[PDB]
Every structure is written in structure tokens, then in C-alpha cells.
């Protein structure tokens, strides 16, 4: 409970949180062959 | 009930009156033979449509394309200018997006003179 | 009436909907499908995704697969059968969605604890660097270094890179690091059951000692592999300064992020019970010793196997002795007022932190003093939990909670006397206490053998049940919080799209400030109860 | 035919048939209703005594076929042309720009 | 305005058995009971207001405007509402299954106590594409007896005993058969707890003991709120989540039945309005419910409220299961019993009479007396042909044999019964789309029946006829199919309705 | 106006057997939609053409003819932002309600995005601008902006009626009266 | 799902008595609904007896449709069927 | 009802019921045991298969997905009995037409 408009620092952290989320949504370029143990998945990972 | 698609090829209002004249011609053809529940849209359409351009054609319609071709006005504006506010100044200012913009002095006046060549 | 009270969504989604809610904000649609189904049905197979949902077969599955792999949202395992072929089963991976729920909170501690330097270009630099890390989910050094602009200082961003490895935080990508704890234990359990050349059928109990002891030492090398390794990071070729391996990639870690907030919980308890100075003296100690302190990592053997009835302690105390070992042996000898941003020796301020021990810390060995990570948790869970009832209900609810915790399992006879004042109001808050669990009810009749009324009653124990009810506070708080924030989007979606294209009118700017207000405050409420939940996830 | 001799008795009447209503019809009362709810059975409404409950048609005898009369409409008159549509519209944006 | 409505023929495929959880009933709620007891009567003209019985719930009388809908008995069917029950009162029928769901689950973690490959093997078993129902009962048994032998709890730490359900409707899990003469870590705390008890008052504990531990309906409901997702399949519950998983097996809400379930039994030899047993049940529930609701924060004590709440589970278990039984019976005990011989009813448009011979009637002909032919009707739709003669049947009157007792216009009136008057001019219009019921006459189709049916030759179909006196007379050529010795036995008579079924009987069953 | 493409099943009685199929299906389809509103596709006016028609089936207990066909019906909606002629009808203090004679009176534009100086008066004077003003019986050009769709309540044989409703924003100069120009 | 061509059929060329029950029933029901008649009608009453007369000259414009277990459909005309 | 002084009727037994089954007549059974005795209509929705009043499915308010059909009164009565006890007598529908 409690709270309210407290800790402007946390507000800045909240703003950053929103900004980081927006960058992920905009994004989907290599990814290479990494960690794939499946030949079927590795073929699809080529593109 | 099942729908096979959102929207087919765009139909403006010309042939509406033309093919509702066929719906006219079929049942009672209104005013002439005056001497169900389809009367709702029947009397409604023909009244609003015709009264506009009075105070139409056959060939010149399909021949109106000529200078309406070279223009980049695309689609949304194209089938729209057929009826509303023809051939005076700020009339067409509203309908077309970006409006005057690119070409101003002469070329747009070529639109006014030809759409004034309607009636 | 009208259902707007949200009674519809209230009953049917404990845990569950939490996961696919967060990934919905992350991605949505197909992404929420697979994970949501991965939870409900648990262990899942590639072909099995197609059968259930009819999810647009093989177009979405192969797309979502690699999408969940880069951010490692799925626990991957592959094996075979005695019949033949091969099989690949997926699990819900650790908590990777909680990290997505974290995000900037992690980067917060990253920025804040990166000082001992002073207000440098580091702020705008690593903010761009770290945000590129978590987003992609994996970062190779060279390909990332290629993203840096040319004709400038290349080691400016590498001024802190080898400083990103630091002590905790970012570590290297290694092999099987993502893997079910149950499965890796079983896979490592091979060469143990398998090992004997028809030795001898004597003392069957020696097969126990054989497999176990050999598994424990093989388990230790695996878990300590990501923990501390100086090979890759400390590489220092000539014609330069220390530079991390351009080949080996990196990843963030649970180590010092889960530690940083855990210390805060200790600080909040400290600061409450002592002065601001004492909290600082206790802080400078924890900052140096947090590296070798298991803390959050404590059980590490718990998930994936049995404990015992008999041998439970012989398991537990085996961990407790190594929880005795490392803190006692390794940790720092007495220092004097190390650096800091009161002259002479500050150990006198430790002595006032010494003479007063209860509830917490102050465990001393001759020659060396340190805070136990074992006996500290019970008094840590006590305080915070007691403050919860303090916040939610009035003062009356508090007093009775400990009254049951002083002695154990007694009737209302000595309770009415020894509690505070009045019968009727006690019965009132007794019903409010017994309202949701946590005191249970006793089991015994008075000379009726379970028959009828007037039997004796007692209030007793039930810790975990008085725990898990704080685990129900996890999702359903954040749920409506995040949901109606997301519902605030689609409602204003027509406005937001107009705002984005603009980046006019009196009333358009009004609702623009509206949502932004609600946005800010709702994220502040999120992080609030976020810190509350994190302390309740253990013991 | 099932490979074991059984049937005609309430203990042996449940072998093949998965229909709960017809089995609760002949002989049973409480169990089959609660048992099917427990195990969350589905099955189908197929047989005769099953259909006479819901009050629908039968899959045997007279109802074994579907009666049809066929229109046999021509494939010619079905298609008219779009009137004064694809002429002016598309050719307007395709000239000079 | 007035959005279009479309329709297509729909059959039925299968059903789905399950338990509605907490979403439906509150959303299925028209009104809320509240108040308490009585009938919740208004004291002026004595109607019902809110409470158990109420205008917008259902209608027990001919007028009774529903206000949810209109047209009363001839239109409205039934409406649903809910009831708030203080505390999660226990179930009745699921009680047997509630022991099983409480069996294979940890009391420590409130989680499944199985281990690795075991679970992995069984999870593969039931997912075999074909399965018999017997396979379900076999494995769900097996997996349940597998957790019996294991004395060791997994992660979540220490453990407990089994649950034998000792008592009724009282659940007690006895922690028992601990390792003999072997000290447990929990036992040292166990015996340590009682040492602080017997110290204060040694009298009572030694007097009676060894009752182990029970489980209250409230805490076992909170014990079911932990396990979600994971595997409920081994417990017999598959989740496509229309429902909230087995939190549903304990009563919280309740589906208060409409007045279409039970009405107020009409009149008496003396004027009055009488209640039915089911009405008394749930209106009593609101009392014993609100009893706990009212006193919490104000009065009473610990050990009083208890048995009253224990009395609540006795009421509901009695409610849905001078019998005083209002529910579980009428479903089980309605107009039938199976000894191997069932019971049945509902044959309309029929007649019964004795037998008598005749040489003159050809086979497939059966003579029906005109006296019972006056009350025996049949539907006829006049089109293009009947127009001539049927309009003459109208003016004829419902007295002589060739007449019509009813008329139905295509304009959909209530109905036109022609006895009381009219006729005459009414036969002048007679539009094509109407329907008129003519008296039974020659050239019709009627099926013959005898009550003690034996084989396929029992039910037959013949032509009808009109003759004098009173009797059912048929050709003496056949005494065989019905086994007719005459002697004045009884014979059934059934007349079809639609043209379809009529042509079906004579052209096939003939 | 626009042309929708939909499918449907038609039941033609024995009475229409004397005429031709295409003529029978026509009348039936006219009794189906006509003035009625079709969900989410907009409002429909008339019927255009008939396609795909195949052999119709027959159910045992009727004797009628059930045919499942697809056809393209003419519906109504210009597009998101189109301006179209009309005029007001009624009023209160919300905003003006413009009715296009020949389709519906459903169009209503409240005053929010309208010119900055517009206000309603209880004085029975409709509206005022800081230019001039107008009233009923005079033509009005209105632009479309927002569109909403809702379901329907059960019919009651002998308010919330937004079956089909459109609203817009007229702030761009030269709207509402056509005699300001010329 | 698709219809088997008129070329080859595994179905018996004759008709079941159950089929005749529906035919006379169906067609006669259409008569009460005021349909036309393709056969000469002598003066008489009822839909039933004029239906049997209609089948005598085989004027029924109906096509019998049968189903196999595998859903191979079928097509059968009443007129072509002989008994 | 049964007997006299109220009104009459007749009896179709299960012993007799098999006889009309042995003839293989479906149409006769549809008229006699449904139309001739008790004819009733029940409003049902495809989703959350249940019974309801008018155009309301109650618990879900749609009126879009509700389909009205016919069904014996004994059925509905049996359902209202079952459903009030804890069980789900859910119903799902499919179209006869369209092949
Ligand atoms: Zn009603
Ligand atoms: Zn456990
Ligand atoms: Zn519904």
C-alpha cells in the first residue's frame, strides 16, 4: 500500500523500463549456429 | 452468416442509380405507373442521388478519365470528386489529402475547368 | 451485478496466467500460446504443440522456437529411447520471464554499484551497452565490437568491458548452463551407477556412498564453473592492457543482482533496529564479502531429487557444514575503517552491534567475526512477515500472532487471560486471524472421540501455509496492475497512434497526460510489491 | 468378437459401448453419472436409444439416406461484369505517375 | 436496426462432463437471495419480494408478470440465481473422490509426491492414442496406490502419514505406522510439543489421546490452491481451463433452483398457497448461513459457532442427497424402477375398447365406431383440392360425423375451436395456408396395438372405417399376431398426425 | 458505398417452383437483408449478383428446397475520413446531429473538435460562432472520423440504440454550409 | 467428401423398401404445401393416394443420395432405378 | 395423465418400443414420442453449452451465438435435475448442411 509520488529516482527507473520495452518490440541479424543441437532447427535458424 | 471477405473492388456512386433503375424497372417502376418493405431504400437512394447534380451522362463519364489520369491523386480522392463541390476554389481544398502542396499555380486549375465542363 | 467487479477472472488462474501475461506484453499472440501451454501441461514436445491448439502448424512453431531460444525462455533437453530415433522435450526455463519483469531494476543496481568511480561518461555508455545485452539475449564480443563506431576510442567502451565481468554480474556463455537440475543430476549420475567391473556383492550400502560422494564432487565442479573462472576474462596479451577474450561471449547472472536486493532487505532490518551510521558500517563489510557468500544460491542441491527422512540431516548438515566452512574460513579478517567516501578504530561501533544481537547477526569466532547465512533467515522471515500483518490490519492483529508463537497449541483459557483485554473483541479478530489459514485449527475432541461439540481447541504452527499465502500475493497484485495498464493502451490505442505519428487541440493533450500519469504510478506500484515478493520466495 | 466371452449382464454389459446414457438406461443409477463426471468422459450421441432421448432422427432404417432434388443451374448466367468500376479507377493512378 | 438472423439445421454430438467453478453461477445470477428466512412476503396483498421466491425468478401462477420476460407460464421457462455460503462448506457426492485428491498429494508442500521417471512413464501411458475407459480406472488406481508405499517426501522437506478417512462427513488423516523404535527429526519435536501440554494440566491429555490429526474443509481448500498447471492429469483432471482446476469440489457459491424446479403446490380443499419441500430447504439455508455471517466481529465465541458450521455441511448434504428429501430422489425416483421391467407413459390421440369378430371386413380394414370417431381428430392442410369439400365440412358442424371440431388460420391466432358458435360465413373465406382438423373417416391410416407386446408382429397398421354401436372389430382371418382369443380383452388404438409418418406406417408396417 | 462478398443458405418453398430459381432466390435474399444491418461489414442496401449456386438438398421432414449460395451485396460506408452531404435534424446541448436523407439519421457530431467558438444556448438559439451560424433545413457537409459497433437487446413486442453509428470532426474550414462559398 | 462419378458404383441397382417409405412420404408432404403435379390427376382427395399414382408413372423429380461408411458419397436417380 | 375422472391416454412400453424399431421406421418415432406428446424449444449457445432464456445465455451475454432448436421436455427436465447437482451436461452443436 502506502506509496504515492515518491522517489523520483524510481520514476526515472520506470521511464527507462518503458524505453527498454519499446526497443524490444521494435526489434525481431546473424544468430549464427549457436547452441543448436537440432539439425532441423539449425536449418530454420539459417534465416 | 458467413462472410467470404471484408471488401471487394471499390464502388463509388454512379451505377447505383443505374442498377437501382433496374430494381425500379422491375417492381412498379414508381412515379410512372402510379397513375415488399423494399420501399425504404428505394425512395431513399434515388431522391438523395439525383437531387444533387440537378440544382446524368454515359460517354463523357468514361471519357472524364483523360486528364484525371495524369494526376497522382490516386484512389480515395479519385472516386470522391465525382459528386461533391465541383469546380470552385477552396471546394476541392478539403477532400484531397496534402491539398495544394506540390503543384499550385496552374495545374490544379486544370481540374476546376474540366469538372466545370461537366454541366 | 454487471461482472465489472472482476469476479470472472478472480477464481480460475493461480500462477499460470502470470507467465503468459508478461510475454504477451513482450511479444503476444503465438508467443503467449506456446509458453502458456508449456506451463499448464508442463513437459512438452515439438509435435505436441501442433496437436492441441491447431496453432497454424510449423509456421509459428519453428518461428517461436528460435525466438524463445535467443532469450532462453525455454529449457532445452534432448535424449533417445531404447526403441530408437530421438526426442526433444521443452520445459519452462527457470525464471526468465521474471528477468523480463526485472529489466531496468537489474540495470539500476548495475549503474548504482558501478561507482567508487565518480560521475563519468559511464552513465550514457553502459546504459546503451547493457540494454543491448538483455534485449538480444546473447552477445558475442567481436560482433558487438563491430557495432561500435570507427575513428574513435575503441577501448573507451572497453574501458568498462573487462570491468563488466568485474566480480559478479556478467559471466561467459558456457555449454549446458541452461538445463533441468533434475536431468543434469541424472545425466551426471551416469558413470556412477554404470561404474563397477563386477566388483563384489558385499555391503550393498557402499553403492550408496560410491555413487553419492562421486556425484557430489562432480556436481561441485559443474556449479562452480560459471561461478568463478579467471581463464577467459583475465586474458592479457602484450601491447595492451587486460582485455576479455574476443571469442567467448557473455551473459548476465543471478549472482550479485539477487544479492544486492537481499542486502537491502538486511539494511531495511538494520536501519530499523540501529542508527544510519551502524547500517553503513555493516554495509561496507557486506560489499566486500558478497562475492564468496552463497546466500540466495543456498540449497543448490534441493531441486531435482529426494532429501530423506533419516538422512535428511546428513544431507542438510552436510550443506550446513559447508555453510559453516566457507563463511568461517574464507571471509575477511578484522579491518579498520577501510575507505568510505569518526577517527581511529570503528570496531567500537561494531561492539554496540555486538552487545545487541537478537534478533539477528552477531555471530563470533575467536579472532574473526561474521554474520551467519543460515540462522539469519528465520529471524529475517519473522520480522518482514510480522510487518505485513501490521500493514494490512490494525494493531490487534499483530499482538495475537506472536501470542500463538510464544508457546504452542493451547486453548482459549490461558489465551483470553494472557493476550490483552477483552473476550468479544478477541473472538472478533480471532475470526479475522483464522479468516485466511495460518493458524489452522487443532484436531482433537474432548472425550467425544471426534463425535460432537464442546471439544477442546488449539491454535498451532503452519509456517509454509502462512508463507504460500504471500506467494498468492505475487501474481494477482501485478496481474490487474499490468493488465488494466495494458487495457489502458488498447482503449487509448487510437490516441497513441496519433501521438506517435505527431512525434493540437485542447482535449487531445488532456488524455495524453492522463495515460502517462497512470503509466508512471503503476510502474512505481509494480516495483514496490516486487521488492516485497522477493523476500518471501525463500523459507 | 472382442476376443473374450462376456455380455448381457450388468457386470458384463460394459465392454465396448462408451455411451453412458444407454448404460445408465438399462441397468444403473448413481455410479455411471458420477463416474463419467470424474474421469471427464466425452464419447458421442450415436445409437438408437441414445437418440430417442435428445429427440432427433435415426441413423438406421428409413433414415439411412438423404433425400435430394437437384436444381441443375447453368454456369453461364451466373457471371455479370463490374459496371464502370475497374476502368476509371485503376487507370487513374497508373498514368504518368 | 434489427440485425439479421440466420439458421441452419443442427444435430447433437457428444457431451462434456465437468464442474462449473465460481465464474458461471455469479454470472448466472439474476437476483441475489440476501434478506433471510420467511417467504420474504409483502404484508398487503401477500406477494413475494426478493429472497428465495420472487417474480423475476420463476412463476407458479397463471398471471405473475416475470419482469425479466413476459407471457408468464406460456412463455417463460426458468431463471437462475446464486447464494452466498459463509466458509467453504464441504461437498457430498465428490466426497469419495475428495479423499483420493487428498491422498496422492503432499501435506508438506501440497504437491505431488511422485518422482521423475515414474511420472514420466505414466504420462506416456495415458497419451497412447486409443484408450478404453477401463484403462483410466486402472492407472488412476495404480498411481494412487504407488504413493502409499513411499514414506519419503521430495523437495519441500519433511513429511507426513496417510489418510484413511476415519469417522459422517468427517475427514481425519491419521499419521501412523512410523518407523519402529527409530527416532524421527519430526518426532522429537512432536513428543516435545506434548511435554509442554501435559506439564500444565496432566489430567485431560492422558485421559483421551491418539486421535492424530484432522483436516478442515477450509484449510484443505487452501491446500488445493497451490497446485496449478503442472500435472492434474494423474489426479484425473485435464485442464483446457474452462474451469479453475480442482478448487471446485468444495461448495462456496450455490445454484439456487428456479420455480420451474419446484413450484408452490396449488390450492387445497380450502383456499391457500402451499410451499414445496425444496423451498423450505434453501430458505432455511439462508438462516443458518447468515448466522455465521452476522456474528464474527461482534458476539459469541470459539466452540459455539463450530458445530453450527458443522451443522451446515449436514444440511447441504441432506439437501442434494417422510423422507424430507427434495432433490437426489426426484432425479433418481421419477416414475420408474428397474427390476428388469421398466415403466412408461405419454400416448396421446388414442382410444381403447373391447373386441368382436366379423366376416365382412377384409384384412387391413378395421372398423372404428363413430362415437369415438367424433372425439378422434386429425390435421389437414387444404390446398388446391380440399377447398371444395372441406369448406362443406366446416358448415356441417361438430355434431354429425362429417364435420370439423377445430380450425387454424395461417395468421397465427390462439386457435379457432368451432363449437360455441360461428360457422356459416366463416367457411366462405378459408385461405389456402390454413389448417383444419376433420373427423376420422374411411380411407385413413391407423395402427393397431395390444398392451402385452411380445414380438415384431404385435404392432401393425390398418385402414379405418365407420360403423355403429361401440366396439373395436377386425377381421377373423387374423387372431395370430395379437394372440386374440376375444373374450372381451382390451386393445390399443393409435392415430398418426403428419403426412410423413402416416405414409410410413401403411406402406411399410402394413 | 462498397460491395461485400458473402455466402448464405436459402430456403425456397414449393410455391415458387413454378418460376425460375434465380428469380426465386432473388426475392428470398431481398427478404433476408434489405434495410437490415449486417454486423461489422456496415449497412447493406441492395443485392447485385448470384454465383457458385449448386444442387440444393432436402431434409426428411419438410419437403422444401434448401440451397447454399454465395453472392455480392451492395453495402454502405465511404471510408474513415470521407466528407459527404447532409443536414441536421434535432438538437440539445451536446453537439449537432446531422442526418443524411436517403440513408439514416444515425450520424451525430458532438462539439469537441469543432471550431473554438461554438456553444449551445438554452435560449432556444441553436449555436453561435465568433462566423455566424445555421440551423435545420439547411444542407451540411460533414466529415467521418470515428465508428462504433454494438450488439442488440432482445426484441419486445407491444435507450442505447447504436446499431450503426458514425461521428466526425469538422474543424477544417468550409464545412456545414455550402452557401458560404460561391 | 467428393462425389463418386456416375460411371462406376458398388451399390445394388435395386431399391430398399425403406426408401419407398420416404419417397411417398416426402412427395405427398409437398402436395399439402401446395406444390404442382407432373401427372394427370383424376378427381379425388388427399396427398397420399395421388402420390402413389405419381410414382406409378415415375414423375418424381428426385435424386436418391446414399452414404457409405468411408464417405464416398453417391448419386442415384429415382427414374433410372428399376424394380 | 392416466386413469379416469381427469383424462386418458395410452401406453408405449420398452417391450413394445423394440417392435417399431424392428420395422426400421424413423419418421414414425419422431412424430409419436415428440410432437404427439410434448414439444418444447430450448435456447442454446455453441460456446459454454448450456440452456437459457430468450436471447440471453445469462453467464455470458452475447445473443450472437445463441441458436434455437427443438428437444423433448423430459430432456431439459433431466438436465435441470443433473445440472443443479454437481455435474456438467454440456451440449455442442454441428451443422447438418454444407455437405
Ligand atoms: Zn421469466
Ligand atoms: Zn513434498
Ligand atoms: Zn453462452
mmCIF file of N, CA, C and O in Angstrom, chain C residues 22 28 58-59 66 86 125 132 200 211 214 276 278-279 319 327-328 338 374 390 442 473 481 493:
data_model
loop_
_atom_site.group_PDB
_atom_site.id
_atom_site.type_symbol
_atom_site.label_atom_id
_atom_site.label_comp_id
_atom_site.label_asym_id
_atom_site.label_seq_id
_atom_site.Cartn_x
_atom_site.Cartn_y
_atom_site.Cartn_z
ATOM 1 N N UNK C 22 3.062 -11.677 -19.057
ATOM 2 C CA UNK C 22 4.272 -10.885 -19.228
ATOM 3 C C UNK C 22 4.834 -11.005 -20.640
ATOM 4 O O UNK C 22 5.295 -10.021 -21.217
ATOM 5 N N UNK C 28 3.394 -11.286 -27.443
ATOM 6 C CA UNK C 28 1.970 -11.502 -27.612
ATOM 7 C C UNK C 28 1.670 -12.639 -28.569
ATOM 8 O O UNK C 28 2.584 -13.335 -29.011
ATOM 9 N N UNK C 58 3.660 -25.421 -37.888
ATOM 10 C CA UNK C 58 5.025 -25.425 -38.433
ATOM 11 C C UNK C 58 5.502 -24.067 -38.949
ATOM 12 O O UNK C 58 6.700 -23.869 -39.157
ATOM 13 N N UNK C 59 4.583 -23.129 -39.147
ATOM 14 C CA UNK C 59 4.970 -21.757 -39.451
ATOM 15 C C UNK C 59 5.281 -20.993 -38.169
ATOM 16 O O UNK C 59 6.276 -20.272 -38.085
ATOM 17 N N UNK C 66 12.992 -20.606 -32.067
ATOM 18 C CA UNK C 66 14.224 -19.826 -32.094
ATOM 19 C C UNK C 66 14.060 -18.479 -31.391
ATOM 20 O O UNK C 66 15.033 -17.899 -30.911
ATOM 21 N N UNK C 86 14.918 -40.242 -31.869
ATOM 22 C CA UNK C 86 15.348 -39.199 -30.947
ATOM 23 C C UNK C 86 14.143 -38.405 -30.444
ATOM 24 O O UNK C 86 13.078 -38.427 -31.062
ATOM 25 N N UNK C 125 27.068 5.467 -21.460
ATOM 26 C CA UNK C 125 27.754 4.406 -22.185
ATOM 27 C C UNK C 125 27.125 3.041 -21.925
ATOM 28 O O UNK C 125 26.500 2.464 -22.815
ATOM 29 N N UNK C 132 21.508 -3.472 -24.807
ATOM 30 C CA UNK C 132 21.738 -4.280 -25.997
ATOM 31 C C UNK C 132 21.966 -5.744 -25.636
ATOM 32 O O UNK C 132 21.776 -6.633 -26.462
ATOM 33 N N UNK C 200 32.161 -56.934 -6.227
ATOM 34 C CA UNK C 200 31.846 -57.884 -5.163
ATOM 35 C C UNK C 200 30.498 -57.557 -4.530
ATOM 36 O O UNK C 200 30.180 -56.388 -4.310
ATOM 37 N N UNK C 211 28.251 -43.909 -5.418
ATOM 38 C CA UNK C 211 27.564 -43.023 -6.354
ATOM 39 C C UNK C 211 27.434 -41.600 -5.820
ATOM 40 O O UNK C 211 27.773 -40.641 -6.511
ATOM 41 N N UNK C 214 30.846 -39.509 -5.242
ATOM 42 C CA UNK C 214 31.424 -39.238 -6.553
ATOM 43 C C UNK C 214 30.561 -38.281 -7.369
ATOM 44 O O UNK C 214 31.056 -37.595 -8.262
ATOM 45 N N UNK C 276 21.788 5.237 11.404
ATOM 46 C CA UNK C 276 22.158 5.299 9.995
ATOM 47 C C UNK C 276 23.638 4.989 9.798
ATOM 48 O O UNK C 276 24.039 4.455 8.764
ATOM 49 N N UNK C 278 25.518 2.919 11.784
ATOM 50 C CA UNK C 278 25.724 1.491 12.007
ATOM 51 C C UNK C 278 25.337 0.684 10.771
ATOM 52 O O UNK C 278 25.964 -0.328 10.455
ATOM 53 N N UNK C 279 24.304 1.143 10.072
ATOM 54 C CA UNK C 279 23.860 0.498 8.844
ATOM 55 C C UNK C 279 24.925 0.610 7.758
ATOM 56 O O UNK C 279 25.038 -0.259 6.896
ATOM 57 N N UNK C 319 25.349 -29.738 4.048
ATOM 58 C CA UNK C 319 25.304 -28.408 3.464
ATOM 59 C C UNK C 319 25.575 -27.360 4.537
ATOM 60 O O UNK C 319 26.204 -26.341 4.274
ATOM 61 N N UNK C 327 31.969 -19.532 5.056
ATOM 62 C CA UNK C 327 31.920 -18.242 5.757
ATOM 63 C C UNK C 327 32.977 -18.087 6.848
ATOM 64 O O UNK C 327 33.559 -17.011 6.977
ATOM 65 N N UNK C 328 33.215 -19.138 7.625
ATOM 66 C CA UNK C 328 34.211 -19.081 8.678
ATOM 67 C C UNK C 328 35.632 -18.965 8.156
ATOM 68 O O UNK C 328 36.358 -18.035 8.502
ATOM 69 N N UNK C 338 37.818 0.963 6.365
ATOM 70 C CA UNK C 338 38.575 0.730 5.133
ATOM 71 C C UNK C 338 38.841 1.978 4.286
ATOM 72 O O UNK C 338 39.966 2.478 4.263
ATOM 73 N N UNK C 374 22.777 -18.916 7.684
ATOM 74 C CA UNK C 374 21.834 -19.990 7.971
ATOM 75 C C UNK C 374 20.773 -19.545 8.973
ATOM 76 O O UNK C 374 19.585 -19.494 8.654
ATOM 77 N N UNK C 390 0.991 -6.179 10.165
ATOM 78 C CA UNK C 390 0.983 -4.848 10.755
ATOM 79 C C UNK C 390 0.431 -3.817 9.777
ATOM 80 O O UNK C 390 -0.320 -2.920 10.161
ATOM 81 N N UNK C 442 -7.020 -26.939 15.635
ATOM 82 C CA UNK C 442 -6.490 -28.199 16.131
ATOM 83 C C UNK C 442 -7.403 -29.356 15.752
ATOM 84 O O UNK C 442 -8.502 -29.164 15.227
ATOM 85 N N UNK C 473 0.170 -13.484 -3.302
ATOM 86 C CA UNK C 473 0.239 -12.036 -3.425
ATOM 87 C C UNK C 473 1.114 -11.643 -4.609
ATOM 88 O O UNK C 473 1.076 -10.505 -5.077
ATOM 89 N N UNK C 481 -2.754 -4.994 -12.076
ATOM 90 C CA UNK C 481 -1.844 -3.869 -12.231
ATOM 91 C C UNK C 481 -1.412 -3.725 -13.686
ATOM 92 O O UNK C 481 -1.688 -2.714 -14.331
ATOM 93 N N UNK C 493 -5.509 3.360 -27.690
ATOM 94 C CA UNK C 493 -4.715 2.985 -28.861
ATOM 95 C C UNK C 493 -4.877 3.943 -30.039
ATOM 96 O O UNK C 493 -3.908 4.255 -30.728
#
